Amino acid sequence: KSKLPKPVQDLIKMIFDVESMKKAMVEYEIDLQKMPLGKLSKRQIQAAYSILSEVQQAVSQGSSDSQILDLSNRFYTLIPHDFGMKKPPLLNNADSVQAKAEMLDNLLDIEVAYSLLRGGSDSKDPIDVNYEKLKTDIKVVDRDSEEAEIIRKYVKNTHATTHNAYDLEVIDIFKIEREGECQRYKPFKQLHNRRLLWHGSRTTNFAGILSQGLRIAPPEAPVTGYMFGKGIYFADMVSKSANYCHTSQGDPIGLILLGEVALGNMYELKHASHISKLPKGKHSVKGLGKTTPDPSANISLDGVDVPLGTGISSGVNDTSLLYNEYIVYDIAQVNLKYLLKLKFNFK
Ligand SMILES: CNCc1ccc(-c2[nH]c3cc(F)cc4c3c2CCNC4=O)cc1
Numbered sequence: 001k002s003k004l005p006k007p008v009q010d011l012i013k014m015i016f017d018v019e020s021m022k023k024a025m026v027e028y029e030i031d032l033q034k035m036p037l038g039k040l041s042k043r044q045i046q047a048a049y050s051i052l053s054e055v056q057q058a059v060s061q062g063s064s065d066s067q068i069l070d071l072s073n074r075f076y077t078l079i080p081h082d083f084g085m086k087k088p089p090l091l092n093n094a095d096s097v098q099a100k101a102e103m104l105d106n107l108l109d110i111e112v113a114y115s116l117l118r119g120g121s122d123s124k125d126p127i128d129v130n131y132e133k134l135k136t137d138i139k140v141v142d143r144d145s146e147e148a149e150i151i152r153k154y155v156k157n158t159h160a161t162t163h164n165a166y167d168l169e170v171i172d173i174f175k176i177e178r179e180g181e182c183q184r185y186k187p188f189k190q191l192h193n194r195r196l197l198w199h200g201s202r203t204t205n206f207a208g209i210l211s212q213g214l215r216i217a218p219p220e221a222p223v224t225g226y227m228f229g230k231g232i233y234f235a236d237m238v239s240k241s242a243n244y245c246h247t248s249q250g251d252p253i254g255l256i257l258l259g260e261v262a263l264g265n266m267y268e269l270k271h272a273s274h275i276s277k278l279p280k281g282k283h284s285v286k287g288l289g290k291t292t293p294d295p296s297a298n299i300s301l302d303g304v305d306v307p308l309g310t311g312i313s314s315g316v317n318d319t320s321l322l323y324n325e326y327i328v329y330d331i332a333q334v335n336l337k338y339l340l341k342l343k344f345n346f347k
Contacts, residue, residue: 001124001125001128002125002127002128002131004127004128004131005140007140007172007174007341008131008138008140008174009127011138011172011174011339011341012127012130012131012134013127014203014206014253014255015113015134015203015206015207015210015255016113016117016130016207018037018114018117020203020204020251021037021110021113021114021204022037024106024110024202024204025037025107025110028081028103028106028107029081029082029083030079030080030081030082030107031080031081031082032082033082034080035079035080037110037114038114040107040110040111040114041111042108042111044078044079045104045107045108045111046218046220047078048075048078048079048100048104049101049104049218049220049221049222050220051071051074051075051078052075052091052097052100052101052104052221052222052224053220053221053222053223054071055068055071055072055075055091055092055096055097055222056094056097056222056223056224058071059092059093059094059097068090068091068092069090071091072088072090072091072092073088075091075100076088079100079103079104079107094224094225097222097224097225098222098224098225101217101221101222101224101225102225104221105217105221106202106204106205108208109204109205109207109208109209110204110205112207112208112211112212113204113205113207113208113211116133116134116207116208116211117130117133117207119133120133133211134207134210134211135178135179135210135211136176136177136178136179136210136211137176137177137179138174138175138176138339139174139175139176140172140173140174140175141173141174141175141338143173147173147175147301148173150299150301150306150308151170151173151258151338151340152170152173153308154196154238154258154306154308155168155170155238155340155342157293157308157309157310157311158198158236158237158238158239158293158307158308158309158311159237159238159239159242159311160237160239160240160291160311160323161291161311162239162322163239163240163242163243165346165347166242166247166344166345166346166347167344167345168238168239168242168342168343168344168345169342169343169344169345170340170341170342171253171341171342171343172340172341173338173340173341174338174339174340174341175337175338176210176336176337176338176339177336177337178210178213178336181213181335181336182335184331184332184335185260185262185332185333185334185335187332188262188264188330188332188333189262189335191262191263191264191283191333192264192265193262193263193264193265193266193284194260194261194262194263194303194304194305195236195260195261195263195304195305195306195307195326196258196259196260196261196301196304196305196306196337197234197235197236197258197259197261197326198234198235198236198237198238198240198241198242198256198257198258199214199232199233199234199235199241199256199257199259200235200240200241200242200243200244200245200254200255200256200257201244201245201255201257202244202245202246203245203251203253203254203255206255206339209257209336210339213331213334213336214232214257214259214331214334214336215232215331216230216231216232216329216331217230223274226274227272227273227287227325228269228272228273228274228275228285228287228325228327229273229274229275229276229327229329230329231275231285231327231328231329232261232327232328232329232331232333232334233325233326233327234259234261234325234326234327234328235323235324235325235326236292236293236307236323236324236326237289237291237293237311237323237324238256239323240323240325241256241257242254242256242342242344245342245344247344248346249346252343252344252345252346253341253342253343253344254342254344255339255340255341255342256339256340256342257336257338257339257340258336258337258338258339258340259334259335259336259337259338260304260334260335260336260337261284261326261328261333261334261335262283262284262328262333262334263283263284263286263326263328263333264282264283264284265281265282265283265284266282266283266284266285266286266326267279267282267284267285267286268286268288269285269286269287269288270288270316270318270319270320270321271319271320272320275329278329283328283333284326284327284328284329284333285326285327285329286324286325286326286327287321287324287325287326287327288314288316288319288321288324289314289316289319289321289322289323289324289325290313290314290316290317290319290321290322290323291311291312291313291314291322291323291324292311292312292313292314292324293307293308293309293310293311293312293324294309294310294311294312295307295309296309297309297310
């Protein structure tokens with residue numbers, strides 16, 4: 001019944017598939033009898049974040065084993081897991097809290113997506129119904145267009161040497177514009193240094209990402225793992241962001257984003273720092289990597305500089321980063337331009 005293009009139709013089907021939501025939850029070890037998709041709520045994930053933040057402070061303070069156990073038990077009581085024989089992994093370190101926090105980041109977007117799906121008027125094709133739910137215009141970029149060529153070159157060129165486990169294939173290029181996002185970004189368009197950068201996420205998140213845009217982790221969330229504090233992270237290297245799709249031989253198709261990001265005065269940093277407050281004058285944070293995209297090969301797509309230069313070496317050898325990463329701490333500093341459907345070819 002829907003007049004929408006097949007790639008768009010196929011995209012709506014994909015980002016709203018309830019089975020891949022459950023499949024994610026199962027992989028996460030969650031008890032689906034006690035915690036089914038429906039019972040999953042914003043308030044419990046908020047509460048769970050808060051417990052993880054407590055576990056972090058308990059680790060920082062170097063609190064009692066009794067404390068860390070009761071704290072760990074409280075988390076698993078809130079987010080019921082099912083290991084069968086295996087005893088629940090004790091949350092008593094940075095990696096443990098970071099891990100569970102990232103799970104919650106995902107569960108939160110899953111809740112966003114499932115709620116969106118269940119909500120609204122219940123005629124009109126369901127694929128059309130759900131496309132409208134995303135409040136995002138999705139248009140297909142022609143395979144043989146100047147646009148597509150620029151994008152595919154950026155994908156080919158900024159594919160790292162280290163990420164040699166896969167080969168990326170651009171199945172579909174979508175030109176997207178989220179409802180009201182353009183007006184939101186318009187004041188930050190006045191800022192200098194507007195770059196077109198990569199953002200990779202699990203497919204289960206993309207309904208929420210298109211629905212509410214990219215967002216920053218709440219206050220409740222632990223500051224652990226966020227190398228440069230809670231903000232929106234980006235890469236000039238397709239590989240770096242493609243990693244975050246969590247693709248496999250099983251599910252080799254993943255989704256990536258191209259977004260206009262107003263960086264302005266970048267706070268160029270070598271090593272990790274949980275910022276919270278940026279220095280007076282600065283608008284973003286640039287994690288300086290040992291490998292930088294060729295600056296002498298920077299292109300200008302719609303008056304936005306695309307660093308599609310081949311992976312060359314940067315002068316900094318005294319850094320904890322292998323590649324460049326960019327962080328903004330105001331969600332309006334981003335305007336999403338493209339969504340790419342990539343096929344990961346493993347070896
Ligand atoms: C606890 N979770 C911590 C955490 C989770 C995700 C990210 C992150 N850093 C990035 C740097 C970068 F350049 C690109 C990306 C990311 C991400 C995750 C989001 N996607 C990116 O492509 C960073 C920290």
